[PDB]
Design a protein around this ligand. Structure first.
Ligand SMILES: O=C1Nc2ccc(Cl)cc2C1=O
Lengths: 369, 364
C-alpha cells in the first residue's frame, strides 16, 4: 500500500472510528483500524462480531493498492498532531509508515486476515430516511433506556406504514409513532431491538439521508460516507400498547419551562416532588427531603384548569424533567387518572402531524402520597 | 438574623466557599458555612484548622443582626436555581429560611459556637502586591509540585522574593525584584501547601496583601481573607543545585519545540533531541519495539555547534518548562548530556514573572 491523503479528512474519519475500538489492549487486533486502498479510495474499518463502522476517504494520489492495519488511538494521536498538508501513508513490510514533510512514523500492523468480516445482509425490512424524525426519536427516548429492555424497539408495520419507537425501564416508558413511512418489508409486521450502545453511536453518525436495513438479526445503517452495523438483541419486547391506559380522567395543559424550573428547584433538596394542581395554580413541594429540609414553589396558571377538588400527585423529579426535555412544544399535556395510577406526559397538539420531527409521549408510575 | 441580598452576589460568594467545605458528610459542621450579619454586611466563612476563607457581601436590607450556619452545598444548589431577584435570608428557630417571591426553603442550622475561630496573626513578614507577578509565578510553577509546597523566600536586604517549586527531577524558580518587603527578621521562608496555592489562584490576582507569622499565611484583598497553615521548616537550598556556568547556550523556537515534542511523545514519554548548526531533530526514545516518531525543524539563525549535541529529555517536563515561559523564543543552557540543563526565557535578565526550569536529563 502507498497513497497520499488529506489530513483533515483522515483525522475526521479517525475520530469516528475511535468508539468502535477496544483501545485498552493495544496488542489485540480489536484495537486496530483496517485499511484498504482500492482505486482512488482509502477504506477504514473497525468492528467486531457485534458492531462496526466502515468509512472511506479519497486520495490525492494512489501509487499502490493493498491492505494493512494500525492501532486506532495512536494513528489518531499522530495525525491530530501534524500540519494541515498531505500525509503519505505507505506500508514497509509488517509496518505502516506515515510521512509528512520533515515528520516520519512507523507503526506495527497485524494480519489483515484476522480482522473480522463486515457482514452483508438480505434485508427482511428496509427504509430510506430522508428526514430527522428517526434520530430525533432515538435521541429523546435514549435517556430512559438502561444499558431486551437494554435496547430501543423499532416496530415496523408495513400494512399501515408505521414505525413505532419505544424505550422503557421498569418505571417509565417513552414511545412515538412515525406514520406515513415508506416501509419496504418481506413481512407485514417486524420488530428490531437496537442495543443502547448502538443507539448512541447512531446519534454521532447519522441524521438524515441514510438507509436502515435489517434481516432480523443485524441492522445495517448506511449513507454516502458510512456503513454501520449492529447485532440486534434477540427476544421479545413487551407489548407496550397493553400497558397504556385506555382513557384518562383528566387532561391538563401546562407550562413546560415553568414546570422544569420549579421541579429542578425542589429537586435541589429531593429526588421526588409533590405536585398540587389547582384552578389557577400549580404547587411543587420537596417530598422525600430530610427531616428539617424543605423546598416549595408555585406558579400561576392564568388559563384555569377544570378541577373543583385540588389534584395531588407524587412524581419522580428526574423522570418528569426528562419527559419534558423530550417535548418540542412550549406547553405540555399531563393526563391522569388516580394519583397512584400511571400518568402521561406528551406534547400539546400531539395528534397533529409533523414533517421534520418525532413527538414522544412518556408514561410514568407515580410516587405514593 | 434577617436580611435581603443580591442573588448573583450571594451565588458568587457561595461558589468560592465550596472548596473549603468537607461536603460528603452533610451532618457535620465541616459541611457548613458560618454566617454573620453585622452592619450592612453579610459575612460567610468556611474554615478548619488547616485552611480557611472569609468573605462578605453587602446587604440590600438589614433588619436583624446575628449569626447562623448552613450546609454550603445545599445552599449553593438552592441559590443557583432561583431568579435574579433579591433573596430574603431569615432565621426561624434553628433553621434558615430562604425566600424569593413564590419560592421558599428551610435548612437546619448548627450551633455557630462549634465553628472554629478565624485566626489572627502578629505578622513576621508582610507585602502588598499591586501587580500580577506573584500569582503569575504561582501558576507557572504549580505544575511541578517540605517539597510538597511552593517556597517563598524573602530577602529584606535585596528587596527580592524568590519562588521555588520542585519534585527532585526538575526545579522551577523565579526571583522577583524591587518588592517592598516589610519584615522584622532578615531572610524569612514560607512554604505554602499545594492545596492552598491552588485555592489562591482562584481568589487573588492583584491588589492583595500577604502576611505570615512563621506558621500561617493570611492573604487579604477587599472582598476576602484567606489563610492556610504553612509546611514546617527546611526547604532544600535550590541555590546549591544550580550549575555555576553552562558550556552551551542556545536560543530556540518555543512553539516549534512544543509541537515537535507533543508530536514525538504520541509514542513515548522520552525523546532524543539532536541539535546541529541549522537543525533540531526529535526522536521518540522509549517507544515500544518497532514504533518510531522522528521530526525536525530548521534553525535559520545558526547555532554555535561543531558536531551534533544529543540530549535525552522527559517530554512532559520539557513541555511544562516551555509552557512556563512568556516569550516566543527560549534559551536552552547545557553542559554534558548526562548533567542537568536549563530552560529559560530569551532576555531573562529583563507586570509578570519569568520562570526558569532546571531538569535532569535522560541517559543514552
Ligand atoms: O413504564 C412503565 N412500566 C410499567 C409496568 C407496569 C405498569 Cl402497571 C406500568 C408501567 C409503566 O408506566
Amino acid at each position: 500500500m502507498k497513497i497520499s491523503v488529506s489530513k483533515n479528512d483522515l483525522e475526521n474519519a479517525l475520530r469516528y472510528l475511535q468508539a468502535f475500538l477496544d483501545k485498552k489492549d493495544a496488542s489485540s487486533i480489536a484495537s486496530h483500524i483496517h485499511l484498504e486502498v482500492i482505486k482512488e479510495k482509502l477504506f477504514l474499518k473497525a468492528s467486531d462480531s457485534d458492531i462496526g463502522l466502515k468509512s472511506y476517504i479519497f486520495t490525492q494520489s494512489s501509487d499502490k493498492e493493498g491492505v494493512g492495519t494500525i492501532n486506532g488511538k495512536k494513528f489518531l494521536d499522530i495525525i491530530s498532531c501534524l500540519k494541515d498538508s498531505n500525509i503519505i501513508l505507505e506500508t514497509k513490510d509488517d509496518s505502516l509508515a506515515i510521512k509528512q514533510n520533515k515528520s516520519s512514523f512507523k507503526l506495527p500492523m497485524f494480519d489483515a486476515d484476522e480482522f473480522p468480516e463486515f457482514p452483508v445482509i438480505d434485508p427482511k425490512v428496509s427504509i430510506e430516511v430522508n428526514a430527522p424524525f428517526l434520530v430525533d426519536a432515538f435521541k429523546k427516548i435514549a435517556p430512559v433506556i438502561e444499558q431486551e429492555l437494554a435496547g430501543i424497539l423499532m416496530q415496523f408495520d408495513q400494512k399501515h406504514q408505521t414505525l413505532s419507537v419505544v424505550g422503557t425501564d421498569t418505571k417509565r416508558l417513552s414511545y412515538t409513532q412515525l406514520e406515513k413511512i415508506s416501509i419496504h418489508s418481506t413481512e407485514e409486521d417486524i420488530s428490531c431491538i437496537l442495543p443502547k450502545r448502538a443507539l448512541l453511536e447512531i446519534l454521532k453518525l447519522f441524521y438524515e439521508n441514510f438507509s436502515f436495513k435489517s434481516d432480523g438479526m443485524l441492522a445495517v445503517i448506511e449513507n454516502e460516507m458510512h456503513t454501520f452495523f449492529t447485532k440486534l438483541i434477540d427476544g421479545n419486547y413487551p407489548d407496550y400498547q397493553k400497558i397504556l391506559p385506555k382513557e384518562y380522567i383528566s387532561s391538563f395543559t401546562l407550562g413546560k419551562e415553568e414546570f422544569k424550573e420549579s421541579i429542578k428547584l425542589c429537586s435541589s433538596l429531593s429526588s421526588t416532588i409533590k405536585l398540587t394542581l389547582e384552578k389557577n395554580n400549580a404547587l411543587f413541594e420537596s417530598l422525600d427531603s430530610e427531616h428539617s429540609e424543605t423546598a416549595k414553589t408555585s406558579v400561576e396558571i392564568e388559563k384555569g384548569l377544570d378541577i373543583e377538588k385540588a389534584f395531588h400527585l407524587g412524581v419522580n423529579a428526574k423522570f418528569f424533567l426528562e419527559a419534558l426535555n423530550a417535548l418540542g412544544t412550549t406547553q405540555f399535556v399531563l393526563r391522569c387518572n388516580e394519583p397512584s395510577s400511571p400518568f402521561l406526559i406528551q406534547e400539546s397538539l400531539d395528534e397533529k402531524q409533523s414533517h421534520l420531527n418525532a413527538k414522544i409521549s412518556t408514561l410514568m408510575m407515580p410516587i405514593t402520597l
